[PDB]
Write a protein that binds this ligand. Sequence first.
Ligand SMILES: O=C(O)c1[nH]c(=O)[nH]c(=O)c1F
Ligand SMILES: O=C(O)c1[nH]c(=O)[nH]c(=O)c1F
Ligand SMILES: [Zn+2]
Ligand SMILES: [Zn+2]
Ligand SMILES: [Zn+2]
Ligand SMILES: [Zn+2]
Lengths: 343, 343
Amino acid sequence: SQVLKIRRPDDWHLHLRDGDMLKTVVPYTSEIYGRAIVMPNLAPPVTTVEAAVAYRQRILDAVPAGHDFTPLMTCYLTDSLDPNELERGFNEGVFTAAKLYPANASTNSSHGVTSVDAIMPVLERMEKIGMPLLVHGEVTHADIDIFDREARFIESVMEPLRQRLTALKVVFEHITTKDAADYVRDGNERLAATITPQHLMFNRNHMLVGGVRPHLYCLPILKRNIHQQALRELVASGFNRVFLGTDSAPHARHRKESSCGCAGCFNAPTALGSYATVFEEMNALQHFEAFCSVNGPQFYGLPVNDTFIELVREEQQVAESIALTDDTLVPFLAGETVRWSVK
Amino acid sequence: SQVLKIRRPDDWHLHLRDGDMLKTVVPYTSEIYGRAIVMPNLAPPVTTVEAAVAYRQRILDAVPAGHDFTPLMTCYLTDSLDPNELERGFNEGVFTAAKLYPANASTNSSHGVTSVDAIMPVLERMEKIGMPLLVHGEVTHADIDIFDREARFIESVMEPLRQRLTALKVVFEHITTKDAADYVRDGNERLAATITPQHLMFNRNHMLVGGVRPHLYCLPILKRNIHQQALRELVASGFNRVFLGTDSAPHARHRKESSCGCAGCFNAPTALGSYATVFEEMNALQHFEAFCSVNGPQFYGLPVNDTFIELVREEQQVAESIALTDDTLVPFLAGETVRWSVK
Ligand SMILES: O=C(O)c1[nH]c(=O)[nH]c(=O)c1F
Ligand SMILES: O=C(O)c1[nH]c(=O)[nH]c(=O)c1F
Ligand SMILES: [Zn+2]
Ligand SMILES: [Zn+2]
Ligand SMILES: [Zn+2]
Ligand SMILES: [Zn+2]
């Protein structure tokens, strides 16, 4: 059966949580990936260098002996955030990028953004020092339909921003529409994107047809088929400014399977093999390593990993659940068979 | 505060299940409604007069003393179903209508329909004897997107059927699109429809924005806002061939809140007040009684109820759950406040 040797990949979009879950989930990433963009959306969020330095250490405490893993920390953008604070953390090599979560006028200034025009100063600073901006591209006005929120973000926020700040390096994170696929495809060298395994593998029918399936519920939300196909074609194309970001967003089973299930997929354990399946299905394994291992590093301006991992096309059963201190974690594709696996 | 006196209403679309749940759920309907269309989608489904007569009796056993309730039984249409069997049950007054669930070529002939062209004989018989056809209007081919399935059904099944059988009386059950709203609005006297409280009250954003909410997950699936508004306008219009059908589809909480939650809303307990809210919100309480109490009877060709119930605009808390032999039932709008209630 078939062996596939690639560079040690990176995860350029990851939530590792905190506390007893941070311990549970880090091994699934640190065992396979060399570096990962850790998100700042904790409670409270990571908006200072002290919080970031501290959190980074907590991650390192969770890393198994022998694992060579490096968490690349990011900063949660808020209205109250001081440009000097972000500038300092970037200079000291604490922050790699800053993350912009959807704007909302009601949002408390300590916990997020009211509008993009409000945080212009820090965005202008990010431009000067050449710091990458990571973007959750969704407009969250109540009137806007959930399946339109990514598309709307491009018109009314993204394009105007990138025109205003021509020199800003922007990662359009976890794109899920043909709209975004095109936007990035036709954009310049300062615009890139990450794509999750679930957004390539499935569409909204998988989440809803024959029952509601909360473990495929995340954001941005699985769109219809024509959008799915767009993403698979973009990565298969060989376009060199898409790269691996899992958006591994683990929630306890009781939280996912409730009257109001949380958004997020714990895919870290199965993502790499899952990607490797989609690239094989698209007859595009020649562009696989690049997507994993090169394109992200090349965009962020970091050295590429110097070690290699192997994948094997031996079919493997995914775990039904992972034990947590309380409750469990249902992984992405739990109990399912996968075509590819790490040796 | 405000009192609203109307005729004793009917529910022209209802699932009452069987066994220990049938006992749990009948009181919620029998206490308020005079008559109700009970669906045949049991396991095994109701496809004989013996099964129907028997099931009818089981329902009557579940009805509290003093409640004047009459279950109007229906037949599940299958390929193997004998026209003479349906003709006999209709003549004997066992069957009121026959229900057509979505076609599917793989479906076992004892449990459903492969295609509409296959069951033409029984449909032609239904036409002759003037028996109403009830329709779940969705095409269930895998390729078709879930939010397009009702719209597709109109083009490729409904219109061709109604042209083929010009004299057939068809209830387009629980319509959920502007497409269906228009179709029925502009149709003839032999075409009517039911509409649920959830399809008037909410749209898909309510189910998905800020978490996945399985207790609003049913079929047909909540569409986007422009479809919601269409339904509210149609009922508010005063159009006299829409009428109350709850599609009360109760599932145990552990079944709704799982890795694969079932489709259905247990709305029977809160539906009437919920409808009364939407008609008030649409400034259309003059057409409320009709929708509840007259239009259905008028379409089915039955006498209208001769007793009256009162509603009051005293705000009332909905139960968080109802106790089942095992597990519980989370009702529609559980723990919520409602504006209208029965006295
Ligand atoms: O971390 C999460 O809970 C999470 N899950 C998501 O599916 N999307 C997000 O944008 C996010 F922040
Ligand atoms: O009875 C059910 O489970 C059910 N629930 C639904 O939401 N739609 C149906 O068509 C149906 F048969
Ligand atoms: Zn995100
Ligand atoms: Zn994320
Ligand atoms: Zn139905
Ligand atoms: Zn039904």
